[PDB]
Design a protein around this nucleic acid. Structure first.
Ligand SMILES: [Cl-]
Ligand SMILES: [Cl-]
Ligand SMILES: [Cl-]
Ligand SMILES: [Cl-]
Ligand SMILES: [K+]
Ligand SMILES: [Mg+2]
Ligand SMILES: [Mg+2]
Ligand SMILES: [Mg+2]
Ligand SMILES: [Mg+2]
Ligand SMILES: [Mg+2]
Ligand SMILES: [Mg+2]
Ligand SMILES: [Mg+2]
Ligand SMILES: [Mg+2]
Ligand SMILES: [Mg+2]
Ligand SMILES: [Mg+2]
Ligand SMILES: [Mg+2]
Ligand SMILES: [Mg+2]
Ligand SMILES: [Mg+2]
Ligand SMILES: [Mg+2]
Ligand SMILES: [Mg+2]
Ligand SMILES: [Mg+2]
Ligand SMILES: [Mg+2]
Ligand SMILES: [Mg+2]
Ligand code: NA
Ligand code: NA
Ligand code: NA
Ligand code: NA
Ligand code: NA
Ligand code: NA
Ligand code: NA
Ligand code: NA
Ligand code: NA
Ligand code: NA
Ligand code: NA
Lengths: 237, 194, 56, 92
RNA sequence: AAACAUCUCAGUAUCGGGAGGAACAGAAAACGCAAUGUGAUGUCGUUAGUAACCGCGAGUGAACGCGAUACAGCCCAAACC
RNA sequence: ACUCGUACGGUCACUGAAUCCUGCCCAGUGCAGGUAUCUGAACACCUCGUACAAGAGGACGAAGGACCUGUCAACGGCGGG
RNA sequence: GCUUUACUGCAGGCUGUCGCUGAGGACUCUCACUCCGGGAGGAGGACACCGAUAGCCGGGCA
């Protein structure tokens, strides 16, 4: 047959690419020689086309002007600080070690200095639970308990824009406009509505999948469709 | 008495033993950070070079070339093929790595011609060979009764036509007797059967 | 809309043009590559053995 | 059917009748060094392996008698045509 | 191959790289009519559809030697300086 | 490529606004987890064999399978008496 | 052209083994190698990656 849609994706053609050229900034923690002295002033609050969430423009003492992954509650004028000795208030960034356990955090680094990887979407947050001289245990929004180097920097507070998911799109048109701001092919045609040549679920006098939908982890691309390595399906039990 | 050279040779018989073993562990680190083709002022295996034709003279160049280890980097078929030809993983190229290295070096020095080459080891995925090239246009070479032969027009691009050291061995021309029926005088003249 | 005559009307785009290297109206001005001599793609001249019968 | 374990009959070696002992031919083990073995290794490569890609024929409903007749005095055995027999059991 | 998978078409078609007026090969870690024998290499004739391969099917397929053509034999590395 | 993205994410699928609802079945097939024991290739190792080698056999045993379990808004099933 | 528990194979995934590969049936370390860091340095570490091979799955493809 023909390569299935999931395979066209990888080639990275226009249709599957994100409108990068239309994006604003790659949100990452600033680099500080040391000392922490680094502080700056919120100059404005903008909309981030890549995350459908607000972002804060900040002017730093040493002249640097960069957009920042804004937590909820940051306003123009506020003074943010980044470093080991940063005060402990929302919007400030400092290593997990210097952060008091029990405090909600966002934009957490996977490894010290990577600029933040975890908890960055609308209204989410990580939860610093345990400290140590060797391991900082954080609970990520997925519920998992992650062990991190206490040297990993983070931002205090939860990400701005919480509750975005609460309102339904209501109409195809709204999805449309959102989708146009992401690296995604939309709308979605069901495999079972295709021809046998286009998808392992395609074909038939009526619409139904050919075999069972749970596919092995070892299935090859072109065949790995449906419920991938499902440990279970349905809702019962 | 033993020539000093004889010692370089002796050392390279077992490149994973003694001092040379440690040198290699050292060098490769820098090599792995170097490019595909790097001209070097002096041959890592002096005895070998000289044995191959190398001379500390103007117009004589040496260069280390890195080549990936393994079989052919082959693309699977995109049309009909009988089972016999649907192969990918086990297919290997008919040209040995040392020959590839010689060609890559030669292309880096369009004006030079390959004289010979020898191996200088390998790690888990590279293989390094040092290629000795010659400037057929530099007097000093044109005037050398032992290398001037490479200046002849008939020798333009020796490597690309397999007239090289490894070139001739890879072509199965080693033996003068049994086994070289489809080899000598050339593979192509023999319908490409060796 | 018919794919024939009615779709022939929008054809006012210029692509292939007189080539600077070979003189054939085969220089694709959009691609900057000659389909006839290879100009723009190859220093060597475009030529294939299939342009003639195998034994000739 | 039944069959005596021992009985008198012609021994092609002795060239005269003598008591023979009947036994079922036990299969010999292969060495894996015969020409066919070397051709299998040699000729098997990428893709289908011609004849070496085939698999075990099948079975006839009843097999023929596969026996060894051993002379009781010279100790040399001889083979005979076999005959279809669903089962063969020796008497004593 | 009266299907077809090994085999065959065929190392063909076609593709990539490159030389010359011709290329390539070439002075034996050869041959092995086993010899008290031959003596660099191409090529032509033959050896021969022979030896060898092969669902031992269809098909595939040399070499030594011999008769010719033309003939040509040398330079490094190292030892010692 | 997704991605100037980070689970309020995005990938892979099924159903197809709302409203009232969505029963029973894990035997087969699929996926997933577990697994005393059984099965399970090659290298290295041991035995025999060979002045070597081919080869025969042993020991060990990964994923996988047997076996057990979970799972149907997973493929699907919901009869005769 | 298409399908599949048709025949035969081929990609791909999983897994053992060998090479890279080092020190003191479970273990520590650091020096290759990998990742993070502008650097200092940090994490990981003889594993992973990559090369070779073996077993299983394998209409994704021929
Ligand atoms: Cl969305
Ligand atoms: Cl050259
Ligand atoms: Cl019997
Ligand atoms: Cl002779
Ligand atoms: K064929
Ligand atoms: Mg970014
Ligand atoms: Mg939704
Ligand atoms: Mg609306
Ligand atoms: Mg788009
Ligand atoms: Mg749809
Ligand atoms: Mg349809
Ligand atoms: Mg299909
Ligand atoms: Mg339907
Ligand atoms: Mg349906
Ligand atoms: Mg010729
Ligand atoms: Mg049309
Ligand atoms: Mg095979
Ligand atoms: Mg036929
Ligand atoms: Mg036949
Ligand atoms: Mg042939
Ligand atoms: Mg011969
Ligand atoms: Mg990197
Ligand atoms: Mg098919
Ligand atoms: Na279907
Ligand atoms: Na050159
Ligand atoms: Na051959
Ligand atoms: Na062979
Ligand atoms: Na036919
Ligand atoms: Na046919
Ligand atoms: Na055959
Ligand atoms: Na004679
Ligand atoms: Na079931
Ligand atoms: Na089941
Ligand atoms: Na068709």
């Amino acid at each position: 047959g023909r390569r299935i849609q999931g395979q066209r994706r990888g080639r990275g053609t226009s249709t599957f690419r994100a409108p990068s050229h239309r994006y604003k900034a790659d949100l990452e923690h600033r680099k500080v020689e040391d000392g922490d002295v680094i502080a700056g002033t919120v100059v404005d609050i903008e909309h981030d086309p890549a995350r459908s969430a607000p972002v804060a423009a900040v002017e730093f003492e040493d002249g640097d002007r960069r957009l920042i992954l804004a937590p909820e509650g940051v306003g123009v004028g506020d003074e943010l600080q980044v470093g080991v000795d940063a005060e402990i208030a929302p919007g400030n960034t400092l290593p997990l070690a210097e952060i008091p356990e029990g405090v909600p955090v966002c934009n957490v680094e996977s490894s010290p200095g990577d600029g933040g990887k975890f908890a960055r979407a609308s209204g989410v947050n990580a939860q610093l639970l345990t400290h140590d001289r060797n391991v900082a245990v954080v609970k990520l929004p997925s519920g998992e308990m992650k062990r991190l180097d206490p040297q990993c920097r983070a931002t205090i507070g939860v990400v701005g824009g919480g509750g975005r998911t609460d309102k339904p799109f209501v109409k195809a048109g709204n999805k449309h406009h959102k989708m146009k701001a992401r690296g995604t092919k939309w709308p979605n045609v069901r495999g079972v509505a295709m021809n046998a040549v286009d998808h392992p679920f395609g074909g038939g006098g009526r619409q139904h999948p050919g075999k069972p939908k749970s596919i092995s982890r070892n299935a090859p691309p072109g065949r790995k469709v449906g419920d991938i390595a499902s440990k279970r399906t349905g809702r019962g039990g | 008495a033993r020539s000093a050279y004889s010692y370089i040779r002796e050392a390279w018989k077992r490149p994973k033993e003694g001092q040379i073993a440690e040198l290699m562990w050292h060098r490769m680190q820098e090599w792995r950070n170097e490019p595909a083709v790097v001209r070097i002022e002096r041959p890592t295996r002096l005895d070998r070079a000289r044995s191959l034709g190398y001379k500390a003279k103007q117009g004589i160049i040496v260069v280390r070339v890195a080549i990936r280890k393994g079989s052919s980097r082959r693309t699977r078929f995109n049309k009909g093929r009988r089972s016999k030809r649907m192969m990918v993983n086990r297919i290997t190229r008919k040209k040995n790595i040392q020959r590839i290295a010689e060609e890559r070096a030669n292309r880096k020095f369009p004006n030079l011609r390959v004289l010979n080459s020898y191996s200088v080891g390998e790690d888990g995925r590279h293989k390094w060979h040092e290629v000795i090239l010659i400037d057929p246009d530099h007097p000093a070479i044109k005037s050398d009764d032992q290398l001037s032969w490479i200046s002849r027009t008939r020798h333009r691009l020796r490597t690309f036509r397999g007239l090289t050291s490894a070139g001739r061995r890879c072509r199965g021309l080693r033996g003068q007797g049994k086994g070289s029926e489809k080899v000598r005088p050339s593979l192509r003249v023999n319908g490409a059967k060796a | 809309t018919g794919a024939g005559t009615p779709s022939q009307g929008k054809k006012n785009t210029t692509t292939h043009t007189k080539c600077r290297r070979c003189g054939e109206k085969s220089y694709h001005t959009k691609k900057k590559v000659c389909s006839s001599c290879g100009f723009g793609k190859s220093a060597k001249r475009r030529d294939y053995e299939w342009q003639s019968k195998a034994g000739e | 059917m039944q069959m005596p374990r021992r009985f008198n009959t012609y021994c092609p070696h002795c060239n005269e009748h003598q008591e023979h002992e009947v036994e079922k031919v036990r299969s010999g083990r292969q060495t894996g060094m015969k020409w066919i073995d070397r051709q299998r290794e040699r000729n098997s490569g990428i893709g289908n392996d011609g004849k070496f890609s085939k698999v075990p024929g099948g079975d006839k409903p009843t097999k023929k008698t596969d026996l060894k007749y051993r002379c009781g005095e010279c100790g040399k055995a001889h083979l005979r045509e076999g005959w279809r027999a669903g089962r063969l059991e020796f008497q004593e």
